[PDB]
Amino acid sequence: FENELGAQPPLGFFDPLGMLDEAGQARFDRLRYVELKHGRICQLAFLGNIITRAGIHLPGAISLDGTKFSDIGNGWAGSFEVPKDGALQILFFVGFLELFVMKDVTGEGEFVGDFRNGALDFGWDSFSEETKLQKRAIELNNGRAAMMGILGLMVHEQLGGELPIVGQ
Amino acid sequence: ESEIGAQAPLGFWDPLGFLDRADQETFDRLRYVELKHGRIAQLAFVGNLITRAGYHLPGDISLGRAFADVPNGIAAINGPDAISTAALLQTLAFIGFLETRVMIDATGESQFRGDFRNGFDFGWDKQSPEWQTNKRAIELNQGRAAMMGILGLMMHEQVG
Amino acid sequence: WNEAPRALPFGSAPPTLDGSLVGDVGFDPIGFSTAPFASFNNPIYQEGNFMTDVQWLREAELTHGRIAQLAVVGFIWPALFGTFPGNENFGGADAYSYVNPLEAINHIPSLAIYQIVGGMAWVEYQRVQRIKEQGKDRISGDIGLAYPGGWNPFNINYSPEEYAEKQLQEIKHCRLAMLGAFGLFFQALNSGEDIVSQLSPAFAAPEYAAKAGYFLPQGI
Amino acid sequence: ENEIGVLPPTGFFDPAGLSDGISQEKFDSYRLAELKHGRAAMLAVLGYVAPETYRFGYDLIPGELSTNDIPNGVAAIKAIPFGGWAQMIAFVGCVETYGWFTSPTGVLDLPDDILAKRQTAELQHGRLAMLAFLELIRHDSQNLAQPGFDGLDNLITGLPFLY
Ligand code: CLA
Ligand code: CLA
Ligand code: CLA
Ligand code: CLA
């Protein structure tokens, strides 16, 4: 486990709590799967939050009874004006995505998280052996960074203050 | 690991997989923590109910303040118009002294971690085959239910 | 334990000091050198491939000392040579005009603080990488400043004796500068003024003690 | 009978005969109490003086009750709410019952004679600190109950350069 990917040179293998110690293989796979899922979710959330704070909003973001897109605020407090049924619809859609589509529905398991539906490849065998490892790393690490960033944004939103760069 | 604690519709119930690796000492420690939390929870639930009813000890707690003057609930310990900090500290010290000098094992009754006979018992001797098992399934069970109940009471009194 | 070491000639020093590390005189009355200071909860520890305890303490000493060496000049310079030519077209509202060192920390843009913190973090990420990759062969300091093999814009070369002499000078200046920085900070805190405005008044005379002057007519 | 902590100023100092025969376990328990009480007294004497000049500037209750405002001495226990004392005692119990926030690198491995001398010194400094604490709280309570009594002014009658 001391040689798998994620051991970026800056720090190398880094396990301060040492939960791995003695372990089989399902534990490592589950940990990597949850880490990757959190990374993807946080990347998407951070991109959405930054693009909404940038100032540009969808002209078609309006909902029932008009509810002009410019009326909707930002942040956890700024999300308490969307219609209830719309949010329920969004949650139902995401839950459906978790129940179907967002899994390995072919049976190929070259690595954890390689769902691909075995049908929507955008060019995979083109890359070299090392390019696969590089892309998997560049992805995971940007996911970790997005996780930390979105947590900081959410915390400082409620704490009250003035973060640099971003207005707040 | 199938012992007292898995019964009543649902069997071995470990949704989060705490006991995936498991140990004898780890299981014993977790069971003791569960039992102690449950006992304290049921005692606190009974006390909160009885002080909600209206009964109060006679006399005064602090210098010029009767037992029936203090508020009922969370406000008794924290917030304005609460018991003086000195009295609460002394009661806490008494609780600690009794906990550390009364309910430890000083003889060697052993059996299960949490037995505090020290030669004093009523009927836990003559009875032996299985009444121990079903009784313990009661002691703990009730503890779980009363623990949930006291948590709910605190929730309601904080939000209500 | 050995007895009567140079410095504390009536005391004792642990057997772990020995020779080795430059700057060694034997000053260690308490201990701190006979305990596993580099092995207990170290997340970067490597069994059979790490440094010793005394070398770890030397690393800590060098870090604290270099920071203090920079800090002393940081305290003295702005008060005596004037402020930085900055604040032009920056909209700082005389941010750099302040000369009391304990007051400037409340008037600088946050970008400066974050730049400093990021630079320090980058430097010591590099230091951590070097420590991990150098194994149980630690040359102390590292970070690859001007010596052959590492970064060396000026191509500095030294004979081994000259290198040892430079190491001794560095460690002595580190210790003295730590003491000096501590003193400067607390003097300035208690006095409520920078060092120059505290020392310059006590240079010539008080105003209420000086004589009025010379008024004797000449030529009479 | 004859262990660490016997010094020439006296020779045994056991007037009441609280030991007499007892047993080894009882004497060991007594010594462990003498140490714990002494260490607590040292820390208390040290911490009774520090707030007189410095004071961390954090809020116990966010919004009110800043540490800059609460009085020093025995008047603090009335000012601090019960929850703070409960949390502090819980933290100390966490330190004591388990090994948390404790490191085995502080035990050191000094030789036998150095260890004996340092243990005796530790005991003596602790024993002095206990009586120091006694005078301190005596003066504080006497002055707080009725001002002007014991005409010496200010907390900490010694070290007058603080005020
Ligand atoms: C002077 C008083 C005193 C003393 C000396 C003790 C001594 C002891 N108690 Mg104890 N206790 C006391 C009073 C005292 N008790 C009182 C008044 C109560 C309430 C009736 C309890 C309830 C209690 C329980 C329920 C347990 C103990 C346990 C223990 C033992 C270990 C405690 C420990 O590790 O530190 C405490 C160390 C900690 C790290 C504390 C953890 C605090 C948790 C994680 C947070 C709980 C939530 C918090 C209270 C509220 C959150 C608010 C929310 C808004 C976030 C020890 C014998 C434990 C035991 O026997 O171990 C098996 C145990 O399970 N005690
Ligand atoms: C936080 C993340 C982060 C990271 C990892 C980096 C990393 C880097 N930056 Mg950078 N930067 C950051 C944030 C960050 N930056 C921010 C927020 C800004 C402002 C927008 C900048 C502005 C910036 C500029 C302008 C430059 C860099 C440069 C660099 C590179 C060399 C840094 C160097 O050697 O400085 C070494 C710095 C020092 C040795 C200064 C140390 C001074 C003392 C001794 C430290 C004392 C710290 C003190 C104890 C803290 C308490 C005091 C405090 C209360 C004020 C390196 C890749 C340089 C480069 O070449 O990159 C292209 C460059 O020119 N950065
Ligand atoms: C008997 C011990 C004792 C007790 C009961 C208190 C109690 C109190 N102190 Mg206090 N204090 C103590 C010792 C003590 N102190 C010591 C020894 C010092 C010197 C450092 C101080 C310095 C001090 C200041 C400067 C302030 C207080 C304040 C307070 C009050 C607010 C609570 C707080 O923040 O405490 C904080 C308590 C501590 C910091 C004591 C920590 C002692 C532990 C044992 C240190 C453990 C090691 C440590 C984590 C670092 C490890 C080093 C490594 C080499 C091992 C409270 C009444 C504040 C106040 O409002 O005053 C009224 C305040 O501003 N205290
Ligand atoms: C993430 C962890 C965490 C959280 C959520 C809190 C939360 C809180 N702390 Mg806190 N604290 C923590 C960690 C934490 N603390 C740690 C690590 C320390 C250092 C030891 C402290 C030291 C500390 C102090 C010194 C004070 C707080 C206070 C508070 C409360 C703020 C005021 C308030 O809400 O009044 C509402 C308060 C209440 C309703 C009363 C709460 C009673 C507590 C939670 C019971 C504790 C029981 C104990 C843990 C276990 C039993 C005793 C044990 C010996 C057996 C709040 C509940 C302040 C406070 O209590 O103000 C009243 C306060 O003065 N905290």
Numbering used by the authors:
A (entry chain 6): 32 to 199
B (entry chain 5): 33 to 192
C (entry chain 3): 31 to 250
D (entry chain 4): 33 to 195
Study authors write:
Diatoms rely on fucoxanthin chlorophyll a/c-binding proteins (FCPs) for their great success in oceans, which have a great diversity in their pigment, protein compositions, and subunit organizations. The light-harvesting antennas of the diatom PSII belong to the LHC family, but they bind Chl a/c instead of Chl a/b, and a large amount of fucoxanthin (Fx) instead of β-carotene (BCR), to harvest blue-green light; hence, they are called FCPs (fucoxanthin Chl a/c binding proteins). Lhcf proteins are the major antennas for PSII, whereas Lhcr proteins are mainly connected to PSI, and Lhcx proteins are considered to be mainly involved in photoprotection, as some of the Lhcx proteins have been found to function similarly to the LHCSR proteins in green algae. We report a unique structure of photosystem II (PSII)–FCPII supercomplex from Thalassiosira pseudonana at 2.68-Å resolution by cryo–electron microscopy.
The interactions within the Tp-Lhcf6-Lhcf11 heterodimer are similar to those in the Tp-Lhcf7 homodimer, such as interactions between the coupled helices C and Chls a406. Furthermore, LHG520 of Tp-Lhcf11 and LHG512 of Tp-Lhcf6 are inserted into the interface between the two monomers and strengthen their associations. Tp-Lhcf6 in the heterodimer has a longer AC-loop and a shorter C terminus than Tp-Lhcf11, which is unsuitable to interact with Tp-Lhca2. In addition, a pair of hydrogen bond between Arg150 of Tp-Lhcf11 and Pro59 of Tp-Lhca2 and a large number of pigments and lipids contribute to the stable binding between Tp-Lhca2 and Tp-Lhcf11. (B) The long C terminus of Lhca2 extends to the PSII core and interacts with CP43, PsbW, D1, PsbQ, and PsbO at the luminal surface region. Both Tp-Lhcf5 and Tp-Lhcf6 are in the periphery of the supercomplex and rich in Fx; thus, they may harvest more green light. Owing to tight interactions between Tp-Lhcf11 and Tp-Lhca2, more efficient EET pathways are formed by Chl a410 of Tp-Lhcf11 to Chl a614 of Tp-Lhca2 (5.7 Å) and Chl a413 of Tp-Lhcf11 to Chl a612 of Tp-Lhca2 (8.8 Å). The shifted Chl a605 and extra Chl a613 of Tp-Lhca2 may receive energy from Chl a401 and Chl a402 of Tp-Lhcf5 at distances of around 8.0 Å; thus, energy captured by Lhcf5 is eventually transferred through Lhca2 to the PSII core.
